[PDB]
Amino acid sequence: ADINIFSVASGHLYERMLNIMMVSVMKHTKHSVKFWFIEQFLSPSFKKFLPHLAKEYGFSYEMVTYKWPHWLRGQREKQREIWGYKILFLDVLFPLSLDKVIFVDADQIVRTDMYDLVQLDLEGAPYGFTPMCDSRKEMEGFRFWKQGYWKSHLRGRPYHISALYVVDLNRFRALAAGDRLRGQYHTLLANLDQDLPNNMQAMIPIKSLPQEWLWCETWCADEDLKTARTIDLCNNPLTKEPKLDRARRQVPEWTEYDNEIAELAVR
Numbered sequence: 584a585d586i587n588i589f590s591v592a593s594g595h596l597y598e599r600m601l602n603i604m605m606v607s608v609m610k611h612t613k614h615s616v617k618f619w620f621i622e623q624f625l626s627p628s629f630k631k632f633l634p635h636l637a638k639e640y641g642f643s644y645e646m647v648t649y650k651w652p653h654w655l656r657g658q659r660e661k662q663r664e665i666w667g668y669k670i671l672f673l674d675v676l677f678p679l680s681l682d683k684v685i686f687v688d689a690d691q692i693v694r695t696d697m698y699d700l701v702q703l704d705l706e707g708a709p710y711g712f713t714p715m716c717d718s719r720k721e722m723e724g725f726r727f728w729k730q731g732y733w734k735s736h737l738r739g740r741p742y743h744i745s746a747l748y749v750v751d752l753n754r755f756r757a758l759a760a761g762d763r764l765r766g767q768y769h770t771l772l773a774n775l776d777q778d779l780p781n782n783m784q785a786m787i788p789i790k791s792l793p794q795e796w797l798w799c800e801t802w803c804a805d806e807d808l809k810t811a812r813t814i815d816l817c818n819n820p821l822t823k824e825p826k827l828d829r830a831r832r833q834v835p836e837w838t839e840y841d842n843e844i845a846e847l848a849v850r
């Protein structure tokens with residue numbers, strides 16, 4: 584497929600949002616699309632519905648199986664285990680033939696042709712992430728990456744949000760980036776999937792994507808929603824507003840797509 588996207592949904596609401604994310608992709612491209620899912624994180628309900636969604640929305644899909652390695656420190660907390668599956672296994676989840684994959688959070692709405700991201704030149708970096716927004720000024724106290732350890736550590740590199748990233752799997756494998764990330768994970772990560780790649784940039788470069796690639800209201804100004812290519816419903820450490828409430832109000836298409844999926848289910 585032209586576009587290859589990987590995501591995870593563990594939890595009822597994340598599954599509901601993942602179906603919507605997938606629909607949002609298909610509304611904005613006429614390229615071929617394949618979704619990749621990790622077997623362990625597929626529930627019976629989701630697995631049952633998935634082929635219907637595929638026959639309606641015109642995507643293909645494949646499951647990968649990868650057991651957390653015995654020698655690799657585990658995560659007792661499910662949420663952190665999931666975040667680990669996002670980042671620790673990029674060289675081993677997928678077939679060797681797969682050239683490139685894009686990770687998109689389940690709680691996203693896409694508003695762009697994701698082939699644009701497939702075509703985007705990473706300029707030798709094995710993966711690309713969007714910088715955190717600076718624009719919403721009221722949230723400065725929560726921008727921990729501008730404080731203490733991170734300002735010094737980053738040496739002028741951005742701190743990037745891990746909701747969306749494109750991985751040149753060939754370059755990533757050639758650089759042995761997976762072994763390096765797993766080695767650093769052992770050595771050291773409150774934000775496991777985000778702190779790790781941002782910490783390792785000198786060793787494993789990030790291509791900083793243009794800012795429009797990922798908008799989250801937590802960090803980003805209202806005025807920049809209109810030019811956002813994708814939207815993430817990232818948790819807001821100030822308001823603690825429930826994600827479902829945010830999904831209903833943020834952009835009109837979330838409810839549009841949820842309703843469309845509901846009508847598919849009636850059939």
Ligand SMILES: O=c1ccn([C@@H]2O[C@H](COP(=O)(O)OP(=O)(O)O)[C@@H](O)[C@H]2O)c(=O)[nH]1
Binds near residue numbers: 591594687815816818
């Ligand atoms: O209980 C969870 C927590 C996280 N995730 C997956 O991990 C991603 C990142 O976590 P989340 O979106 O909750 O983080 P935020 O963007 O809110 O900081 C989610 O979109 C899901 O794909 C999940 O499936 N179940």
Ligand SMILES: [Ca+2]
Binds near residue numbers: 689690815817
């Ligand atoms: Ca998210």
